[PDB]
Design a protein around this ligand. Structure first.
Ligand SMILES: *[C@@H]1O[C@H](CO)[C@@H](O[C@@H]2O[C@H](CO)[C@@H](O[C@@H]3O[C@H](CO[C@H]4O[C@H](CO)[C@@H](O)[C@H](O)[C@@H]4O)[C@@H](O)[C@H](O[C@H]4O[C@H](CO)[C@@H](O)[C@H](O)[C@@H]4O)[C@@H]3O)[C@H](O)[C@H]2NC(C)=O)[C@H](O)[C@H]1NC(C)=O
Ligand SMILES: *[C@@H]1O[C@H](CO)[C@@H](O[C@@H]2O[C@H](CO)[C@@H](O)[C@H](O)[C@H]2NC(C)=O)[C@H](O)[C@H]1NC(C)=O
Ligand code: NAG
Ligand code: NAG
Lengths: 324, 585
């Protein structure tokens, strides 16, 4: 019997709302639908494991709460003991295949309506339009959606066009940050799907900004031979999305890492200041044994999807004391 | 000695920044070639570059992780070399940033997870990747490439069916897992755009299961039945095993319990109206095979007819019959119907014969009967056996010949005729005349004649004026019936036949009237009237006139007197009528 293990699509849900677990195998893996499987004289069976690896009991149905309509299972409502893996089996007598589907029955976080560990995630920009959706509902399908903010019914400002399953902030403010939990009726029961909104500055269109060192000011660092050297670049990035900042050093036409052999190397990019969602990052050059050898031109390079800016520093030594 | 030659050449690759790229070089030669990885002819070594060797002295893999762009972006080469020759192969490497990952580039949506199978058990690894065009899936174990060339073997590759819409599914199937299979596995998704790795998942392998699963098996099989047409019956089926199987009832192909609701382990069947016969299947299925077991439900309605209704003994008034039961099943008893051959009247019926042999009594001798046999049990009378006809053969006549009569023809010859017995009792094979000239001899010395169903015969050569005694019997093929007698006749002229409708009535206390009918013979002299006072009287004769009736006078009141008639012709005396007696008033 060909086992496909746990399916990609997980089912998570708050103790007390209805849930319809479709069998994944029809909707992806295998070619046909349910009715045809029956026609060809195949059996459909369900088993329930409590996790891996507990042995699967063939799951005892009533008809009220835990029913078995055609190719899925219906819970109404969900119960804490309902959590687990639900194996879904199909069979000729020369043919056997099953997949597991994962179901997590969770509880509201202390004082709230949502579960803190069980909410979606979205992001938006100031002065630009975001459309929060209410997703994965499709099985319950234009009824009334009651949007809450931090689990409290509020009076919404005029820039917010509620349609059916959506809501559209035509101009996003900083206040818009928070936990939008939407609510829906069916069953009759109550289902909740909550998404946390974080907002950022708009998409920067300018190349980053050097600090240490300035893009014009040829600044110089003193060092003596045999000492160790710390050339700490410091630059500023406008919000460029999830893309990690691109800041790096160079010596002439040599890139640092290749030159080394464990004497001269680039650190790990520290984030010094992070704020919705623009950053002030830092990466430093490190020279262990300062030869003659290393002295001279080291340029810090900064770059995003808007251009490439570099600044230049100097590595050198102080001569004899004020004796001239 | 042979120079080195490639068994596997590296192919170009295109990976993604902060990801993985792998290159493969495997080679054969004598002696075993050493392998070196070059960037522009120079044996490169680099902490971001790792070289892994195959357990067999073959080749090696170059792995670069995490990818850095555009540094790594360069032309590399594989070189295999021994002191017998040298070989090299070129290949190109490209690395991308995610800021310009093409639309339709592979992405891992879900990667393999830690799995623990026991040794010699089937392990399956799972993966999820998407892309446009559709991604190719490959596998690595402990950094080395698997490749299963023969696709049939302990280790085989499974593939998803691409419905137009979903991520590509993909798996690695390992029959009979062994400890060599232990290690750190990672999967790889490729297409014309580039290559992406999932995250590493370790595989673990244990020695044995505490206990393994149990295939389904019948605790309570489904038991056959006979029932009346439309009765009731509770049929129970119970299956067990681990995991416990479901039990659906089945009429061969079609399923009897509806899929959207199918009970677990214990289904008991309630039946209503079996009219026609049928076959019922009870299926149990766990994940360790499907098992079956059938029940036959049939209704009977009657025994079949017996066979061989054959007679092994017979008598004249009874017949002993035997038959085989003719039936596979338990019949309670049998009933025999019989009536005479060519009779259209209803058959007689005999109840309760508890065996396969029976003697039918109370029959009439030498009489024809037709038989069939039917078996009966508690449902009803079945069809009759094939029929049998049989004649009750009588072993001899049981009555004397009737109407033995004789009359004279010529002077040396007489004519004897008679009619058939009331008890002919068989095919009459003939008749017998015991004629003789000497009515005092023992019978084997009298003289012998023969008739064969002709009712009449003549006997000649008698000498006139002699007493001949005569007696007659009938015989069948088995043997002889009884004798009749009344002849010691004297051989002269022809004689008349005794009258019929002979009766006597007392017209008075001293007178009595007689009514008789004269035969055909017109020439009649007179009739003979033997009267005697009762039984001990004297045989006196009276002269009566040839007419129709006569009046006798001169008798005693309230007294009995016997009388005996015998026609008298002027050529000779005839035959005598039945003995009648009349009482005076
Ligand atoms: C090359 O030379 C440069 C010198 O310019 C070095 O740069 C500094 O390295 C030091 C390493 O110790 C860093 O020191 C750290 O300061 C951080 C900033 O303070 C926090 O708090 C403020 C609130 O006032 C926040 O706004 C701010 O964002 C920070 O979160 C700390 O985060 C560091 O860690 C922690 O230290 C104490 C333990 O004593 C904890 O309890 C605290 O919670 C604190 O978080 C640390 O204190 C310094 O930031 C670096 N400066 C720059 C500009 O990068 C390079 O390290 C050096 N390179 C080498 C040696 O390789
Ligand atoms: C939106 O919901 C999140 C999740 O509960 C809140 O995050 C919490 O913030 C408080 C700060 O007072 C912390 O003490 C909690 O530990 C956080 N919880 C989690 C799960 O991160 C967030 O505060 C909410 N937004 C608002 C405006 O209240
Ligand atoms: C059932 O078994 C047959 C065996 O010929 C196989 O071809 C088929 O794919 C199996 N499943 C269905 C739905 O027919
Ligand atoms: C659990 O959810 C209910 C809503 O059904 C809510 O009223 C309650 O506050 C939640 N529990 C806690 C501890 O907050």
């Amino acid at each position: 019997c060909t086992d496909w293990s746990v399916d990609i699509k997980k089912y998570q849900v708050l103790v007390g709302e209805p849930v319809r677990i479709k069998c994944a195998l029809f909707y992806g893996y295998i070619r046909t639908n349910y009715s045809l499987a029956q026609s060809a004289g195949l059996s459909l069976m369900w088993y329930k494991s409590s996790g891996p690896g507990d042995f699967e009991e063939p799951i005892a149905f009533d008809g009220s709460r835990m029913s078995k309509e055609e190719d899925s299972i219906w819970f109404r409502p969900t119960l804490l003991q309902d959590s687990g893996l639900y194996a879904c089996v199909i069979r000729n007598s020369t043919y056997c295949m099953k997949v597991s589907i994962s179901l997590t029955v969770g509880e509201n976080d202390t004082g709230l309506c949502y579960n803190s560990k069980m909410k979606y995630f979205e992001k938006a920009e100031l002065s630009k339009s975001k459309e929060i959706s209410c997703r994965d509902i499709e099985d319950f399908l234009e009824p009334e959606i009651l949007w809450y903010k931090e689990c409290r019914t509020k009076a919404w400002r005029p820039s917010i066009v509620f349609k059916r399953d959506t809501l559209l902030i035509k101009e996003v403010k900083e206040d818009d940050i928070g936990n939008y939990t939407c609510e829906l009726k069916y069953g009759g029961f109550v289902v909740r799907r909550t998404t946390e909104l974080t907002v950022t500055a708009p998409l920067t269109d300018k190349p980053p900004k050097l600090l240490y060192p300035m893009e014009s000011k040829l600044t110089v660092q003193e060092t003596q031979l045999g000492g160790s050297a710390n050339l700490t670049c410091r630059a500023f990035f406008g919000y460029s999305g999830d893309v990690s900042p691109l800041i790096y050093w160079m010596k002439g036409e040599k890139f640092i890492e290749d030159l080394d052999e464990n004497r001269v190397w680039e650190s790990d990019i520290r984030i010094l200041k992070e704020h919705l969602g623009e950053q002030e990052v830092s990466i430093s050059l490190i020279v262990d044994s300062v030869e003659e050898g290393d002295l001279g031109n080291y340029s810090c390079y900064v770059e995003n999807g808007n251009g490439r800016r570099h600044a230049s520093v100097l590595l050198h030594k102080r001569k004899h004391h004020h004796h001239h | 000695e042979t120079p080195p030659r490639f068994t596997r050449t590296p192919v170009d690759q295109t990976g993604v920044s902060g990801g993985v790229a792998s290159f493969i070089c495997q080679a054969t030669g004598d002696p075993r070639p050493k392998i070196v990885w070059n960037k522009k002819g120079k044996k490169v070594s680099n902490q971001r570059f790792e070289v892994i060797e195959f357990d067999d002295g073959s080749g090696s893999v170059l792995r670069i992780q995490p990818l850095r762009t555009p540094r790594d972006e360069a032309i590399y080469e594989c070189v295999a070399s021994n002191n017998v020759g040298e070989i090299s192969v070129s290949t190109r490497l490209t690395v991308l940033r995610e800021d310009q990952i093409p639309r339709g580039f592979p992405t891992i949506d879900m990667g393999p997870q830690l799995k623990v199978v026991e040794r010699t058990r089937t392990a399956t690894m799972l993966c999820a990747a998407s892309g446009n065009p559709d991604p190719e899936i490959t596998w690595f174990k402990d950094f080395l490439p698997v490749d299963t060339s023969n696709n049939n073997g302990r280790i085989k590759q499974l593939r998803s069916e691409s419905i137009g819409g979903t991520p590509i599914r993909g798996a690695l199937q390992i029959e009979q897992s062994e400890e060599s299979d232990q290690g750190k596995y990672e999967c790889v998704a490729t297409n014309s755009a580039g290559t992406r790795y999932s995250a590493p998942a370790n595989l673990y392998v244990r020695e044995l299961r505490e206990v393994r699963r149990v295939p389904p098996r019948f605790s309570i099989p489904p038991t056959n039945h006979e029932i009346m047409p439309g009765g009731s019956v509770n049929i129970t089926c119970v299956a067990v095993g681990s995991p416990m199987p479901y039990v659906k009832w089945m009429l061969g192909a079609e399923d009897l319990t509806p899929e959207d609701d199918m009970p677990i382990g214990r289904n008991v069947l309630e039946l209503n109206d079996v009219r026609q016969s049928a076959n019922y299947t009870c299926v149990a299925m766990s994940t360790l095979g499907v098992i079956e077991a059938i029940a036959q439900i049939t209704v009977k309605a009657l025994p079949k007819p017996p066979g061989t209704p054959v007679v092994t003994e017979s008598t004249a008034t009874s017949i002993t019959l035997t038959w085989d039961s003719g039936n596979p099943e338990p019949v309670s008893y049998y009933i025999i119907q019989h009536k005479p051959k060519n009779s259209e009247e209803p058959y007689k019926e005999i109840d309760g014969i508890a065996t396969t042999r029976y003697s039918v009594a109370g029959l009439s001798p030498y009489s024809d009967y037709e038989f069939r046999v039917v078996a009966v049990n508690n449902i009803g009378r079945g069809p009759a056996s094939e029929p049998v006809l049989t004649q009750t053969s009588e072993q001899a006549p049981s009555s004397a010949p009737r109407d033995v009569q004789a009359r004279m023809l010529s002077s040396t010859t007489i004519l004897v005729q008679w009619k058939e017995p009331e008890e002919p009792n068989g095919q009459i094979q003939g008749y017998r005349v015991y004629y003789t000239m000497d009515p005092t001899q023992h019978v084997n010395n009298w003289m012998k004649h023969n008739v064969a169903d002709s009712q009449i015969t003549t006997i000649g050569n008698l000498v006139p004026q002699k007493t001949y005694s005569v007696k007659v019997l009938a015989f069948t093929s088995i043997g002889d019936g009884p004798l009749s007698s009344d002849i010691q006749v004297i051989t002269q002229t022809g004689v008349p036949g005794q009258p019929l409708n002979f009766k006597a009535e007392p017209e008075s206390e001293t007178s009595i009237l007689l009514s008789w009918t004269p035969p055909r013979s017109d020439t009649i002299a007179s009739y003979e009237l033997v009267y005697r006072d009762g039984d001990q009287g004297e045989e006196q004769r009276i002269t009566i006139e040839p007419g129709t009736s006569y009046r006798l006078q001169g008798l005693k009141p309230n007294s009995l007197y016997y009388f005996r008639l015998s026609a008298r012709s002027p050529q000779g005396l005839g035959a005598s009528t039945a003995e009648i007696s009349a009482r005076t008033m």
